[PDB]
Structure formats: structure tokens, C-alpha cells
Unconditional design. Structure first.
Length: 268
């Protein structure tokens, strides 16, 4: 009935309350994902090669969303690139501006990502709102395959980010990124964690982990454009495929599991 906040961490003021945004929230009960609420195929982004988003890799079980990584049984060529692995994409068909957005997620234990984020959809927007604003709440991988120093702990942190890019010429916005990082206390695939963001205003973004405030970030440009939820399991170029193909794990180890996604507005 309220967001997950430990005692002493709820940022609301005493005459305010948190209200569930029903069309951006799901406990994932039942046997099949609700495709009137969520888009899992037909989306603009098919996947970063070599990981192709498959609708078949999305399942529900036991009141949770499961996005499972796979080896494709044969390569698939799309946009002149070869795909060899299956990930998955789940995007909210409804958007909002501002609010509190949280999920409870356990990452997969593979070289592919486990993510929870917001982005606007600039080509449907007008004038300067065609610029991109992306708010990454958590991005993780389960198996680090690049020995670059910047990423050696990427599998045991909350890695949050805010991006401004694709800005139309003449529009007075800056491009760039403002990151946040915090310790999970364990690997992202070992336990569930609650990853949350208070998208408080166009210039105040506050990240929470397991019900505790971690950081406040000023984004690189105003975040005052409607944004849509994303839960995505992909390949990143900087975390390449391991020598065994990276898909020998159990179904559980190949699965990013979200127990729920809850989105809220703060009202007077």
C-alpha cells in the first residue's frame, strides 16, 4: 500500500501521500504477462547485437516476471548484424512525468544485463522534446567478461545514471551523463533488491536501494518529458560473449526475476 522505504527514509512531507499509478504497476500474478500494459514485441529497439529481444523469453511464474537469457538455436541476421543470443524487453505502454518508481529484482548470473529504467520517446514528442532523456535506476550484469578496471565491480553495485542526448540543433539543452553508484552488499544475482528512484522534479533525481536513500543527482538536462518504464536483458558491447557462449547456467541462473514493479505519484 506504499513504496518500500525503511523507517526514517520516506521523503514525503506529512500532508502528502503516495498513490499507485495502476497502468505502470504490476505484481505479475497469473500465467501470461499483460500485453495491454506491457510491450514485449513490436517495439522500436530489437536488441543490441548480438542479443536479440525475444517475446518467448518473457514468462510469469509465482507472482514474478521472468526474463530469461538463451542461446538462439541458429543465428538471426537483422539490420546487417548477426544475433546469436536471446534476451528480452518489457516496456510500459503508458508513461508519466515525475513520481516514485521501484522494482524488486534479482539479476541473472550471465554476461547479459539486468536493468530497470525510464526513457522518453522523443520521436513522438514535439519541438525540443524530441531530445532524449534516460533515467537508469539499475543496470547490472551477472558475469564480468571484460577486465577493464572501471567495471570490475559492476555485478555487486547499484549502477544508476541520467543521460541527455539526441538534442535537436537550436534547443538550449546540454548533452551528457550524471551517474550514481552504491554497494549492494553482495552480487546482484545472489539476492533480490529493491531499486527505486524519486523522479522528484525536472532537476532532482533521488535513488534508493532496499528502502534507503543512496544519492541525489542533478540530471544533465531538464527531465520534464513523459517517460516509460523498461525492464531489459541485453548484451552490452563492453561485456562480450564468454568462450563457452555464456549460456550453460541453469534456467534460474539465466533468468532476471522482477517480483513486482510499482509506480507512484506523490499527491497533496
Amino acid at each position: 500500500e506504499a513504496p518500500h522505504f525503511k523507517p526514517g527514509e520516506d521523503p514525503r512531507q506529512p500532508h502528502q501521500e503516495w498513490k499507485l499509478i495502476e497502468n505502470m504497476s504490476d505484481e505479475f500474478e497469473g500465467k501470461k504477462i499483460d500485453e495491454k500494459k506491457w510491450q514485449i514485441s513490436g517495439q522500436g529497439w530489437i536488441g543490441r547485437a548480438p542479443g536479440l529481444f525475444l517475446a518467448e523469453n518473457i514468462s510469469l511464474n509465482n507472482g514474478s516476471l521472468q526474463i530469461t537469457t538463451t542461446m538462439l538455436p541458429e543465428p538471426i541476421v537483422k539490420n546487417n548484424k548477426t544475433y546469436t543470443h536471446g534476451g528480452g524487453y518489457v516496456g510500459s505502454r503508458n508513461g508519466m512525468t515525475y513520481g516514485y518508481y521501484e522494482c524488486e529484482m534479482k539479476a541473472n548470473k550471465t554476461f547479459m544485463s539486468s536493468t530497470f529504467w525510464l526513457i522518453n520517446e522523443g520521436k513522438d514528442r514535439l519541438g525540443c522534446d524530441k531530445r532524449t532523456t534516460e533515467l537508469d535506476i539499475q543496470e547490472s550484469v551477472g558475469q564480468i567478461t571484460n577486465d577493464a578496471d572501471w567495471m570490475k565491480y559492476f555485478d555487486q553495485t547499484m549502477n544508476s545514471n541520467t543521460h541527455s542526448r539526441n538534442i535537436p540543433e537550436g534547443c538550449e539543452y546540454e548533452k551528457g551523463s550524471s551517474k550514481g553508484k552504491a554497494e549492494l552488499g553482495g552480487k546482484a544475482y545472489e539476492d533480490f533488491h529493491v531499486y527505486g528512484v524519486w523522479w522528484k522534479s525536472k532537476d532532482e533525481i533521488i535513488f534508493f536501494l532496499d528502502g534507503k536513500m543512496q544519492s541525489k543527482v542533478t540530471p544533465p538536462a531538464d527531465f520534464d518529458i513523459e517517460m516509460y518504464l523498461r525492464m531489459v536483458v541485453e548484451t552490452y558491447d563492453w561485456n562480450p560473449v564468454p568462450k563457452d557462449g555464456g549460456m550453460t547456467g541453469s534456467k534460474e541462473d539465466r533468468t532476471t526475476t522482477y517480483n513486482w514493479v510499482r509506480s507512484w505519484q506523490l499527491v497533496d
